Amino acid sequence: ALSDTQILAALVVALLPAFLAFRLSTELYK
Amino acid sequence: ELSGQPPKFGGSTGGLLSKANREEKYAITWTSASEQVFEMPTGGAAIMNEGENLLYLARKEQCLALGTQLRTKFKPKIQDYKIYRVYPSGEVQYLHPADGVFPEKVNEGREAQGTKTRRIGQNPEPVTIKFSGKAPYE
Amino acid sequence: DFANLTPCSENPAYLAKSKNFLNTTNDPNSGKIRAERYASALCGPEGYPHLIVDGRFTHAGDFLIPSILFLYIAGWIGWVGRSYLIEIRESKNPEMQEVVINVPLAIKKMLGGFLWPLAAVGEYTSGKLVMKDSEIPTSPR
Amino acid sequence: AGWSLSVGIIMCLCNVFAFVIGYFAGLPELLATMSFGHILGAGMVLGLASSGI
Amino acid sequence: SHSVKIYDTCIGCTQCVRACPLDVLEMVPWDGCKAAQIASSPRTEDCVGCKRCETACPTDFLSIRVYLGAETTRSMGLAY
Amino acid sequence: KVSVDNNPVPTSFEKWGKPGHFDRTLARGPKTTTWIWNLHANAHDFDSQTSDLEDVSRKIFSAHFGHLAVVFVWLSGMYFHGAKFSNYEGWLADPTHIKPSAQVVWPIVGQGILNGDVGGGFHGIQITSGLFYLWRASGFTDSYQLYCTAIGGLVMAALMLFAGWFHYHVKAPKLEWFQNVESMMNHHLAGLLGLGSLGWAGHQIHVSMPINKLLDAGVAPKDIPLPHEFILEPSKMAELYPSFAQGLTPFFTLNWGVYSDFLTFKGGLNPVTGGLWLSDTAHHHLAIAVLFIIAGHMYRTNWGIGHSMKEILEAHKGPFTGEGHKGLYEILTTSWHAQLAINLALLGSLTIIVAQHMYAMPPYPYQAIDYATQLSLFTHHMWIGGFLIVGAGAHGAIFMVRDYDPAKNVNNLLDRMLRHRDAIISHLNWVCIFLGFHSFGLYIHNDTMRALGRPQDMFSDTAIQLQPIFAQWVQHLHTLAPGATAPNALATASYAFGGETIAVAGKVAMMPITLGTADFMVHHIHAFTIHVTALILLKGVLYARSSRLVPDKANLGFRFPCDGPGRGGTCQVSGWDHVFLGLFWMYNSLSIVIFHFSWKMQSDVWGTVSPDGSVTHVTLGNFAQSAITINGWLRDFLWAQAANVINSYGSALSAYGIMFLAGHFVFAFSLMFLFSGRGYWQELIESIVWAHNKLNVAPAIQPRALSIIQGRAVGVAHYLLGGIVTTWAFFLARSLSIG
Amino acid sequence: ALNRGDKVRIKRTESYWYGDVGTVASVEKSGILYPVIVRFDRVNYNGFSGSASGVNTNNFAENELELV
Amino acid sequence: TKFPKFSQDLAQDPTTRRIWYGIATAHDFETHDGMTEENLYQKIFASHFGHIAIIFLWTSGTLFHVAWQGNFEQWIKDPLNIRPIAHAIWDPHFGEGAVNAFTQAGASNPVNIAYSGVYHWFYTIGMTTNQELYSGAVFLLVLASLFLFAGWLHLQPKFRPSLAWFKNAESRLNHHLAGLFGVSSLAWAGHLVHVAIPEARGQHVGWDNFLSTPPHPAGLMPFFTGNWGVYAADPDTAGHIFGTSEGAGTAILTFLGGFHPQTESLWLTDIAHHHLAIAVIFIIAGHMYRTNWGIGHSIKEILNAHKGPLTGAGHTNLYDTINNSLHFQLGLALASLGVITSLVAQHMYSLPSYAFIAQDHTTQAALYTHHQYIAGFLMVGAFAHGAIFFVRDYDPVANKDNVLARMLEHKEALISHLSWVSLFLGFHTLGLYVHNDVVVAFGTPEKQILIEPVFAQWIQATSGKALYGFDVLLSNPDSIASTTGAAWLPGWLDAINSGTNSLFLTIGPGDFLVHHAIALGLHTTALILIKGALDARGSKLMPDKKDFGYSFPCDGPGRGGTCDISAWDAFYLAMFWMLNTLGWLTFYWHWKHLGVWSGNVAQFNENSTYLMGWFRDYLWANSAQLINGYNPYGVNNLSVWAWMFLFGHLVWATGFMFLISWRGYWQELIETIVWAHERTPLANLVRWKDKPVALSIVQARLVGLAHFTVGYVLTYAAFLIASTAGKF
Amino acid sequence: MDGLKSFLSTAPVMIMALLTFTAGILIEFNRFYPDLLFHP
Ligand code: SF4
Ligand code: SF4
Ligand code: SF4
Ligand SMILES: [Cl-]
């Protein structure tokens, strides 16, 4: 389960930098 | 407000578009001593009626183009022309010649605008007016 | 002291090609003469002459001699031309003589440029060569 | 030129002489008639021989 | 629209006004020069910025100056 | 009908030493360097030099006399070089083994290497002008004959130069005289072309045909009797052509059938030399001659008979065209630009026809053999014709701005056209886009299918095929014409349509040029690029006077950079700037035409012939399978066939390697002018000027950056030069190597 | 004041002739702003693209000139 | 709200020009509606955070894709014969001939061969498996998030820094030097001795055990004493095999000099010792300026001290000039970053720091070409913002008579001279090239003009390259410099005298001419850019240019014509020249290394002195395998590059359209199309919300240049890779 | 006539006079003394 389910999870923790890029984007817009 | 006779013209593709009926169009009137041919600013030959004429054009610049032609391309010179802006509201406003006399000729009664009590090389430095919408020529 | 290069006379690549040198002019031995003349230069492994311009007087003819010969001719041209450009100003119709030459005046100045270095040092030491900055057309800073 | 060919051409000279009095928009003007008649008679005698095979 | 300005170096030869193809400019009385008149730009809304006026001006550096600005249907010169 | 003024202008050298006298602006003197460029750009603009149409016509008339003079000097120098600097006689004795050469280079700085071995113990540059093949067919068999022609060419050059002077300084025709169109038309048709075509038919039958008949029998040149003792001894003419045995010719008997011996209609190529039968070209010119003497008897002059072109034109009106050709006779007899616009369009379109016809029907002996001459002559007359049909677009617009009158053109063809210009250009606009996608977008589809490993998806003869159904069908009818629709024509007009594959020596003169999907695609590229060139130049004529952007463009003139940064930007609206943009597309268009030619001929036509008849093509038929992708063109045409020119250093073709790089340079040089603007350059010059002011060396004629127009003029002048010089060196080195 | 004929140096600094020298052609009566008319040996840039010359004359104030 | 929100002037534009110009001005925060100075800096500061996070998110991307779809574990078993994989390929348009081609590098599915050289880098720093890579991708994923939240936090009112906090140059410098540079360097030295050096000797150290195994037999005892000699005890031997214990030593901090004999890269023990020495001299460096403890300098105070008799006011008020103008700051930063980026390129091809990379010729070619192009862009931009400074921030009063002012004061002398030097180089450098072409072309190549790089050759000699035999300094065993003595020198002298690497390559006549062609390119590019900046405020042709700003179309066809007269148009023109300079440059590097890698240096040496030689041997000959990537017979792994090659040529030429033909032609042509639309029935119900217009005069210049630039690099990139990947 | 003399004295006539004379000198020297790459 080293590089099998590792494709997942990595995608979950990739939602954070995406979501925080969206909050930063709307503040720079204003 | 006023009117005249449309020049006898077969019609062209260079004429008015939907801007005329939604935004604005323009009208030029003038007086001719005879029936004579003139060049349409929108391309093509047309003939003006003896007496008063009424022609609608798409832009203000097109009207003044004919106006200058009328004042310079006929041995009996035409200088009686008047330019109007016709709105789709029905509102017609007078434009040229503004106060009766051509602008080429100084007239007492006009208001000075855009004038600067200053040489052009006496504008302020752009650094001094930073973070203010104004530019040096203001 | 360049180790990499060797004299063309002692360079095998050159010596082999050297005897196959083409005739440049109508002289049937011109290729032969070149072969003998370049033989006193330094060659690379390909057997072609290389020139040394670092200042070695042992290769003065590689750059120093053609340098002096150029700067003499170039300065001659420059000096005579400038000499003419200044004299036609006094005719108060100069623009024309720049487009239709005053040949008698031109030729006069050309045959005098053979001493231009002494002329140039003279004008400099009399303030006639260079003009003040304050007395020259300038753009806004 | 032969009798038949000969006369066969004068008939065409009379043909052009008739066609010009027909449509026209004079002694020197008769030169054009004698000219067109020959060329109009050249396509005939060559056609007559070529067509006969 | 564009901005058109006139500076006190105006000699009042009117050459710019009769150059303008959209009737933007006009002459008005003034005591600055011999010609006793100065150019003026009371109809800049109709200015396209072709700079024919600037070409016509004779003073060492221009006395009239067109600074292009916010594009409109008029200043872009659209017949549609 | 002749009227003249006597001595209108004295003959004085005082004007010579006053440059720019011809113009009021320049006659004063130069204040800036712009004065110098303007003196050159306006020297021929006779319109802007005077308003008297009588005076410009007189200038234009004696202008041509000077032009005919230099062309004579040019031509005379060709005969002289072939007479005292060539191996023509050497080649004439051994036509199939020797290569034609003229101009021998002097031995200095080792340039003598350009004197390659052309066989027969002669050294020089191998020529591709075709002069040797023309001179043989014309009847030359000695150096003296060519030499005499050269002297005669200098005489005629002098007389052109005398007439020019005389007809401007002594006896100047009146405007009335020039406007005699009906008389001028009658004479050019019957006098120039008519008698000209008849006169040459006289040379061919008496000089060319008999001499050229012996050369094909292998008599040699020196054993052949001169052209004079063919007339002085009519019995000699009788020996070759039996029909000619009749002293007093019965041509007037109209029994023309007897001349079947030397006025033939073989309609093929000579199997010995691979050229058109001289009897065909003689019967040809004799046939055209008559049609021209005839045609020159149509228009009225001084005898009531004839036509009025004014009446003909005016009497051609329709329900759709209003007043029709009314007023056209007037503008074509008062505007030279109107005349030049039509004449360029047709002359230019004609020179292109010359190209497409001369190669498929080689009129000259041993011409088809020389693939360099073949490739040289064809792309030559292609470029020439292309330049002319771009000037036709320039003078079309110059007429509209300068000599056009609204009062003299009311609801006629010319006026009606201006009134739906928007509809014309808008429709052509769509057509060009349609052609761009459905032609070029085929190649892009192919490269991609090829690269994705999907060859069966490509447009190709071995996959989904685009056969030129229609073009193939006319080839069928052309080779089936002899016997049926062409009973008296023995063979087909050109073997390219099909039929036998003829060969001379061991090479192919001409063989069936089959058409497949590869041909279909480029033919639609040629349609595409030509329509676009039309659009630009046509749009330049119609909107020369006004547009929805600039209503008063006519007061601005034919040639002006713009009307300022306003209106969003009005850069390049002038009719001149449309000629400018059109020059690139003329180049782009014709470049692909001459490339289509070079590859198609080497790959599918040219080659050698083994004893058993099998043909070995130069590029081995790689066309139909490589000419359908851009990678194919880049690789199997450019990269492959360029191997010759870049490997020319050290050979006689070294000059071509050098010019190949030169063309590349001036092209790149041109981009300096096309991508920048004089604003930058003027500010730069200010810094450089200050330095001269610092040393008291500033010139009185103040330096100025080029005008906006000149920047463009310079720009396109170099782009076109390089691009063409490049291809010249490429084509030459390539074709000179194949044989 | 400045007389006609006097050779004069330009100090305006927006002037094509700043640093260059001109010739006093004539002076107009007060109280015009720039009454001194100066003539220059060489032209400026003035003129539509393609012009073979420019303008050789301009008005100045006495404060922005320097006698030579 | 109507786009753009930041410009009401643009928002009212009824044409399509609104959309474009809204995009082109989004990042020029200074021109926005109601922008203050304090709100500017705060917006930049936040924008910076967002940029860093994009970087870490990009590296995480490569790290993750190598681990997931790459053969990194197989590659470290044989880095000299296996091709490193970049990423997987998923393209439904692939045909059979294509799928078989890109199935390579041992992979069972279609893949791309990596050319970034990250395999070599990861391996060298101690990456051993796809678990450390993946663990590296995730860490850089949360690090990115760390900064994306920071940028968001500093826009909140409670955390918004003051304008006085951004203008504090003293404290920012002390920290950037001692902390950002120093500690960061000291922390990499820590990694090298703990992970990279051990794991290169077979001894695994990682998050498992690093806290309980010393990097040396001794334990920081010699350090806190003064016997640092022990850390240079037993270096790795000449016969050390990288990755294993065979030949490994115990030293952590050496100064061996030269290359590791197997990996042909610098010794990790040298690389480690480097970042340790640098760290110290960077920490003490961050103690220079004054903060809250009296000690230190004011930059203002010391700057005002440097004035002399020849430079008038000296550097007075330059502190405030710079500290007030961001375009000034941005200019120095770009200029400096752009030089060392070149230095990176020049030092990474001659002194590799990654094991087995000097054997991977393609990556060495890409990494050099890559970083030089980046460097070329940075240098233009440095001058661009330099011109913008003179237009928007320069104050002639505060800067009066100082060195900045005096640049302008004699700007004529600068530009005319820079113009002479360019003409000097151009006329002659081309002169010899064309002499040689003609001379060679006539079968007399012996008449060529071949000048020896004596000065540059002599430079090599002073560093110990005895091939030329000048016998000076280090190539002189009797000199004081050689007897200094020892330390790094034996390793270095062996490194420089083996003609087996790219360390001070032997240079001749071919090298002489190209360097001068390169000098032409640096002077001319600088001639354009410097003029564009000095004349940004005004020329005699436009004395009031500053009033119009940096970028504007022109000033009409009056006064002779003023096309391309703005400072922006100087950047636009200069770009063409920078590309040109890089072309010559990268052409030189590639053709010369092709010879090196072939053992056939005679090709470049003997054919580079005339230009047909470049055209024939470098361009025409090496395109052979590229243009055959696909053809009527088949398709190989170079299929893309072949296709991209054309794609590049196409984009390039499409740029000529926007560059040669100018607006007015197109504005007219559009009107007919607008007419056609309104007149076509049925299609009238559809009315555009934005009036179609032709691109602006500046817009077309920009767009044309963008095509020209995209075409320039994509074409060459397809040639560099394919030619080098094919021929090796 | 003196008008002819001014024509021969025009810039273009005169520059092609100098370039031709200069060329002839360079050529003729390289005829008698070819292949001088440097001073012996
Ligand atoms: S032109 Fe320069 S001057 Fe003649 S008016 Fe319009 S402005 Fe005052
Ligand atoms: S610009 Fe074209 S328009 Fe705006 S003013 Fe000077 S002229 Fe009348
Ligand atoms: S040219 Fe330089 S200036 Fe005359 S228009 Fe096209 S751009 Fe505005
Ligand atoms: Cl292919």
PDB file of N, CA, C and O in Angstrom, chain F residues 447 451-452 553 568-569 571 631 635 639 649-650 675-679 683 686, chain H residues 93 95 437 441 531 539-540 545 561 563-564 572 620 627 630 639 662-664 668:
ATOM      1  N   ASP F 447      -0.050  15.647 -41.989  1.00  0.00           N
ATOM      2  CA  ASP F 447       1.101  15.628 -41.087  1.00  0.00           C
ATOM      3  C   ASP F 447       0.750  15.002 -39.743  1.00  0.00           C
ATOM      4  O   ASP F 447       1.543  14.259 -39.164  1.00  0.00           O
ATOM      5  N   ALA F 451       1.973  11.469 -38.258  1.00  0.00           N
ATOM      6  CA  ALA F 451       2.768  11.484 -37.035  1.00  0.00           C
ATOM      7  C   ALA F 451       2.126  10.655 -35.921  1.00  0.00           C
ATOM      8  O   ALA F 451       2.820  10.157 -35.035  1.00  0.00           O
ATOM      9  N   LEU F 452       0.805  10.510 -35.971  1.00  0.00           N
ATOM     10  CA  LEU F 452       0.085   9.704 -34.988  1.00  0.00           C
ATOM     11  C   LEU F 452       0.103   8.224 -35.362  1.00  0.00           C
ATOM     12  O   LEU F 452      -0.520   7.401 -34.692  1.00  0.00           O
ATOM     13  N   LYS F 553     -10.407  59.808 -47.870  1.00  0.00           N
ATOM     14  CA  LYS F 553      -9.098  59.215 -48.119  1.00  0.00           C
ATOM     15  C   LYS F 553      -8.477  59.724 -49.419  1.00  0.00           C
ATOM     16  O   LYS F 553      -7.263  59.641 -49.610  1.00  0.00           O
ATOM     17  N   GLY F 568      -8.676  54.188 -33.289  1.00  0.00           N
ATOM     18  CA  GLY F 568      -8.181  52.883 -32.894  1.00  0.00           C
ATOM     19  C   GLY F 568      -6.839  52.560 -33.525  1.00  0.00           C
ATOM     20  O   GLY F 568      -6.116  51.683 -33.049  1.00  0.00           O
ATOM     21  N   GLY F 569      -6.510  53.278 -34.597  1.00  0.00           N
ATOM     22  CA  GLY F 569      -5.297  53.041 -35.356  1.00  0.00           C
ATOM     23  C   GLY F 569      -5.631  52.859 -36.822  1.00  0.00           C
ATOM     24  O   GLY F 569      -6.428  51.991 -37.184  1.00  0.00           O
ATOM     25  N   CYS F 571      -3.199  52.612 -39.442  1.00  0.00           N
ATOM     26  CA  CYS F 571      -1.964  52.280 -40.137  1.00  0.00           C
ATOM     27  C   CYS F 571      -2.245  51.489 -41.407  1.00  0.00           C
ATOM     28  O   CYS F 571      -2.972  50.499 -41.375  1.00  0.00           O
ATOM     29  N   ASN F 631       6.000  18.264 -43.745  1.00  0.00           N
ATOM     30  CA  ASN F 631       7.249  17.591 -43.407  1.00  0.00           C
ATOM     31  C   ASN F 631       7.897  17.002 -44.651  1.00  0.00           C
ATOM     32  O   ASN F 631       9.119  17.010 -44.794  1.00  0.00           O
ATOM     33  N   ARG F 635      11.435  18.196 -46.034  1.00  0.00           N
ATOM     34  CA  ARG F 635      12.481  17.180 -46.039  1.00  0.00           C
ATOM     35  C   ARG F 635      12.854  16.721 -47.448  1.00  0.00           C
ATOM     36  O   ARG F 635      14.007  16.840 -47.862  1.00  0.00           O
ATOM     37  N   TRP F 639      15.243  20.253 -47.785  1.00  0.00           N
ATOM     38  CA  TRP F 639      16.422  19.643 -47.170  1.00  0.00           C
ATOM     39  C   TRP F 639      17.185  18.735 -48.134  1.00  0.00           C
ATOM     40  O   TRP F 639      18.416  18.698 -48.122  1.00  0.00           O
ATOM     41  N   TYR F 649      30.796  24.850 -52.479  1.00  0.00           N
ATOM     42  CA  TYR F 649      32.097  25.446 -52.186  1.00  0.00           C
ATOM     43  C   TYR F 649      33.223  24.554 -52.703  1.00  0.00           C
ATOM     44  O   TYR F 649      33.378  23.416 -52.254  1.00  0.00           O
ATOM     45  N   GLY F 650      34.002  25.076 -53.648  1.00  0.00           N
ATOM     46  CA  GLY F 650      35.124  24.349 -54.212  1.00  0.00           C
ATOM     47  C   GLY F 650      34.876  23.873 -55.633  1.00  0.00           C
ATOM     48  O   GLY F 650      35.730  23.211 -56.224  1.00  0.00           O
ATOM     49  N   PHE F 675       9.726  45.517 -39.199  1.00  0.00           N
ATOM     50  CA  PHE F 675       9.293  45.315 -37.817  1.00  0.00           C
ATOM     51  C   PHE F 675       9.425  46.563 -36.941  1.00  0.00           C
ATOM     52  O   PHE F 675       8.908  46.586 -35.823  1.00  0.00           O
ATOM     53  N   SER F 676      10.118  47.587 -37.436  1.00  0.00           N
ATOM     54  CA  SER F 676      10.365  48.800 -36.653  1.00  0.00           C
ATOM     55  C   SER F 676       9.654  50.020 -37.245  1.00  0.00           C
ATOM     56  O   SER F 676       8.823  49.900 -38.150  1.00  0.00           O
ATOM     57  N   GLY F 677       9.991  51.192 -36.717  1.00  0.00           N
ATOM     58  CA  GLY F 677       9.388  52.442 -37.142  1.00  0.00           C
ATOM     59  C   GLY F 677      10.392  53.574 -37.037  1.00  0.00           C
ATOM     60  O   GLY F 677      11.332  53.499 -36.245  1.00  0.00           O
ATOM     61  N   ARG F 678      10.194  54.627 -37.824  1.00  0.00           N
ATOM     62  CA  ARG F 678      11.184  55.699 -37.922  1.00  0.00           C
ATOM     63  C   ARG F 678      11.307  56.518 -36.641  1.00  0.00           C
ATOM     64  O   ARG F 678      12.275  57.261 -36.470  1.00  0.00           O
ATOM     65  N   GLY F 679      10.329  56.390 -35.751  1.00  0.00           N
ATOM     66  CA  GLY F 679      10.371  57.079 -34.474  1.00  0.00           C
ATOM     67  C   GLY F 679      11.640  56.748 -33.717  1.00  0.00           C
ATOM     68  O   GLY F 679      12.391  57.644 -33.329  1.00  0.00           O
ATOM     69  N   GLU F 683      15.295  59.333 -33.253  1.00  0.00           N
ATOM     70  CA  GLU F 683      15.850  59.646 -31.940  1.00  0.00           C
ATOM     71  C   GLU F 683      17.288  59.163 -31.818  1.00  0.00           C
ATOM     72  O   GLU F 683      18.102  59.778 -31.131  1.00  0.00           O
ATOM     73  N   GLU F 686      19.654  61.468 -33.584  1.00  0.00           N
ATOM     74  CA  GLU F 686      19.875  62.674 -32.790  1.00  0.00           C
ATOM     75  C   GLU F 686      21.129  62.542 -31.934  1.00  0.00           C
ATOM     76  O   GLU F 686      21.872  63.508 -31.756  1.00  0.00           O
TER      77      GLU F 686
ATOM     78  N   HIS H  93      -5.720   9.862 -29.463  1.00  0.00           N
ATOM     79  CA  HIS H  93      -5.492  10.061 -30.893  1.00  0.00           C
ATOM     80  C   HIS H  93      -4.309   9.247 -31.408  1.00  0.00           C
ATOM     81  O   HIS H  93      -4.050   9.214 -32.610  1.00  0.00           O
ATOM     82  N   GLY H  95      -2.123   6.299 -32.773  1.00  0.00           N
ATOM     83  CA  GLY H  95      -2.313   5.127 -33.607  1.00  0.00           C
ATOM     84  C   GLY H  95      -1.265   4.082 -33.278  1.00  0.00           C
ATOM     85  O   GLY H  95      -0.368   4.335 -32.475  1.00  0.00           O
ATOM     86  N   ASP H 437      34.140  32.746 -46.226  1.00  0.00           N
ATOM     87  CA  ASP H 437      33.205  32.038 -47.097  1.00  0.00           C
ATOM     88  C   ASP H 437      33.658  32.092 -48.553  1.00  0.00           C
ATOM     89  O   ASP H 437      33.748  31.063 -49.223  1.00  0.00           O
ATOM     90  N   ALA H 441      35.128  29.129 -50.573  1.00  0.00           N
ATOM     91  CA  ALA H 441      34.267  28.739 -51.686  1.00  0.00           C
ATOM     92  C   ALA H 441      35.026  28.625 -53.006  1.00  0.00           C
ATOM     93  O   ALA H 441      34.627  27.865 -53.890  1.00  0.00           O
ATOM     94  N   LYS H 531      19.030  53.190 -24.777  1.00  0.00           N
ATOM     95  CA  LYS H 531      18.481  54.348 -25.474  1.00  0.00           C
ATOM     96  C   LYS H 531      17.006  54.501 -25.125  1.00  0.00           C
ATOM     97  O   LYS H 531      16.539  55.598 -24.823  1.00  0.00           O
ATOM     98  N   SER H 539      12.902  63.274 -26.269  1.00  0.00           N
ATOM     99  CA  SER H 539      13.925  63.557 -27.268  1.00  0.00           C
ATOM    100  C   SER H 539      13.551  64.859 -27.964  1.00  0.00           C
ATOM    101  O   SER H 539      12.520  65.455 -27.651  1.00  0.00           O
ATOM    102  N   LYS H 540      14.381  65.308 -28.900  1.00  0.00           N
ATOM    103  CA  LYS H 540      14.050  66.490 -29.689  1.00  0.00           C
ATOM    104  C   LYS H 540      12.800  66.240 -30.526  1.00  0.00           C
ATOM    105  O   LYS H 540      12.084  67.177 -30.878  1.00  0.00           O
ATOM    106  N   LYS H 545       7.581  63.455 -23.940  1.00  0.00           N
ATOM    107  CA  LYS H 545       7.242  62.038 -24.007  1.00  0.00           C
ATOM    108  C   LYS H 545       6.798  61.493 -22.655  1.00  0.00           C
ATOM    109  O   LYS H 545       5.903  60.650 -22.586  1.00  0.00           O
ATOM    110  N   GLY H 561       7.085  61.613 -38.795  1.00  0.00           N
ATOM    111  CA  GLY H 561       6.568  60.291 -38.482  1.00  0.00           C
ATOM    112  C   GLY H 561       7.194  59.789 -37.195  1.00  0.00           C
ATOM    113  O   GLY H 561       8.399  59.942 -36.992  1.00  0.00           O
ATOM    114  N   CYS H 563       6.600  56.454 -35.598  1.00  0.00           N
ATOM    115  CA  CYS H 563       6.304  55.045 -35.363  1.00  0.00           C
ATOM    116  C   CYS H 563       7.328  54.403 -34.428  1.00  0.00           C
ATOM    117  O   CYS H 563       8.531  54.643 -34.549  1.00  0.00           O
ATOM    118  N   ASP H 564       6.838  53.582 -33.503  1.00  0.00           N
ATOM    119  CA  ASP H 564       7.693  52.873 -32.553  1.00  0.00           C
ATOM    120  C   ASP H 564       8.595  53.817 -31.756  1.00  0.00           C
ATOM    121  O   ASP H 564       9.782  53.542 -31.574  1.00  0.00           O
ATOM    122  N   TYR H 572      10.320  46.197 -27.173  1.00  0.00           N
ATOM    123  CA  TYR H 572       9.809  45.351 -28.249  1.00  0.00           C
ATOM    124  C   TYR H 572      10.857  45.082 -29.333  1.00  0.00           C
ATOM    125  O   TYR H 572      11.018  43.945 -29.778  1.00  0.00           O
ATOM    126  N   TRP H 620      21.864  21.816 -41.440  1.00  0.00           N
ATOM    127  CA  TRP H 620      21.367  20.886 -42.449  1.00  0.00           C
ATOM    128  C   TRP H 620      21.624  19.428 -42.068  1.00  0.00           C
ATOM    129  O   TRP H 620      20.752  18.575 -42.224  1.00  0.00           O
ATOM    130  N   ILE H 627      13.728  15.431 -38.874  1.00  0.00           N
ATOM    131  CA  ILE H 627      12.697  15.537 -39.903  1.00  0.00           C
ATOM    132  C   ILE H 627      12.221  14.169 -40.401  1.00  0.00           C
ATOM    133  O   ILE H 627      11.322  14.091 -41.238  1.00  0.00           O
ATOM    134  N   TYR H 630       8.686  11.217 -38.520  1.00  0.00           N
ATOM    135  CA  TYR H 630       7.647  10.523 -39.268  1.00  0.00           C
ATOM    136  C   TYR H 630       7.838  10.758 -40.766  1.00  0.00           C
ATOM    137  O   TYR H 630       8.354  11.796 -41.181  1.00  0.00           O
ATOM    138  N   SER H 639       8.888  11.425 -33.148  1.00  0.00           N
ATOM    139  CA  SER H 639       7.731  11.881 -33.914  1.00  0.00           C
ATOM    140  C   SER H 639       7.231  13.242 -33.436  1.00  0.00           C
ATOM    141  O   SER H 639       6.953  14.120 -34.251  1.00  0.00           O
ATOM    142  N   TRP H 662      -0.122  46.322 -40.742  1.00  0.00           N
ATOM    143  CA  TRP H 662      -0.553  47.114 -39.595  1.00  0.00           C
ATOM    144  C   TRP H 662      -2.056  47.389 -39.626  1.00  0.00           C
ATOM    145  O   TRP H 662      -2.741  47.078 -40.602  1.00  0.00           O
ATOM    146  N   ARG H 663      -2.546  47.985 -38.544  1.00  0.00           N
ATOM    147  CA  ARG H 663      -3.964  47.953 -38.190  1.00  0.00           C
ATOM    148  C   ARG H 663      -4.956  48.352 -39.281  1.00  0.00           C
ATOM    149  O   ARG H 663      -5.866  47.584 -39.593  1.00  0.00           O
ATOM    150  N   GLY H 664      -4.790  49.549 -39.837  1.00  0.00           N
ATOM    151  CA  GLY H 664      -5.780  50.131 -40.727  1.00  0.00           C
ATOM    152  C   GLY H 664      -6.306  49.201 -41.801  1.00  0.00           C
ATOM    153  O   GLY H 664      -7.478  49.280 -42.167  1.00  0.00           O
ATOM    154  N   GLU H 668     -10.578  48.186 -41.685  1.00  0.00           N
ATOM    155  CA  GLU H 668     -11.424  48.299 -42.866  1.00  0.00           C
ATOM    156  C   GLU H 668     -12.049  46.955 -43.219  1.00  0.00           C
ATOM    157  O   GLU H 668     -13.251  46.870 -43.472  1.00  0.00           O
TER     158      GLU H 668
END
